[PDB]
Amino acid sequence: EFLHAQEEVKRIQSIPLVIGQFLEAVDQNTAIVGSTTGSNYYVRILSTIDRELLKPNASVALHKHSNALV
Amino acid sequence: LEEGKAGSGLRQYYLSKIEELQLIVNDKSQNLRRLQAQRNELNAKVRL
Amino acid sequence: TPNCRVALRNDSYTLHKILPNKVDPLVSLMMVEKVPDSTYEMIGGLDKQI
DSSP: OHHHHHHHHTTSSSSOOEEEEEEEEEETTEEEEEETTOSOOOEEOOSSSOSTTOSSOOEEEEOSSSOOBO | OTTHHHHTTTSHHHHHHHHHHHHHHHHHHHHHHHHHHHHHHHHHHHHO | OTTOEEEEOTTTSOEEEEEOSOSOTTOSSSSOSOOOOOOSSSSOSOTTTO
16 A cells, blocks of 8 residues: 555656746745746645755646646 | 372473463564554554 | 735635745845854954954
């Protein structure tokens, strides 16, 4: 069950994803991201990305529906 | 010795036999609660 | 607070959470995060000024 939890997590990043930009960081694992569609959002992020790549800005990938950082 | 000849004959058979039966039940309980806590770690991972 | 951002649910447009860190896209230059700068005693001879 721990491997099936690993599998369904580690295939959230193989999707024809949309591209946005990192804007601000609120707290632990939740941020503001602005998309290339405009209309600034507020989503939760994953548990995998090392947080030393998001300092003022980053070209980032976003989910289609839940619009999370990927 | 009404009891003394028989405490070595028909009771020494039993109480020597229950000795190792007491040891393994003592042994598996240390082994069981170890298995308990190792399962509680992995359930704490998957549920989280 | 007036002129403060909040989290708005896309479900029924209900409010979710007050969002801190108000709109300011130009405090990259201001309030430097790290100061492992020089010390206080290597100035050496400006004690009236200090």
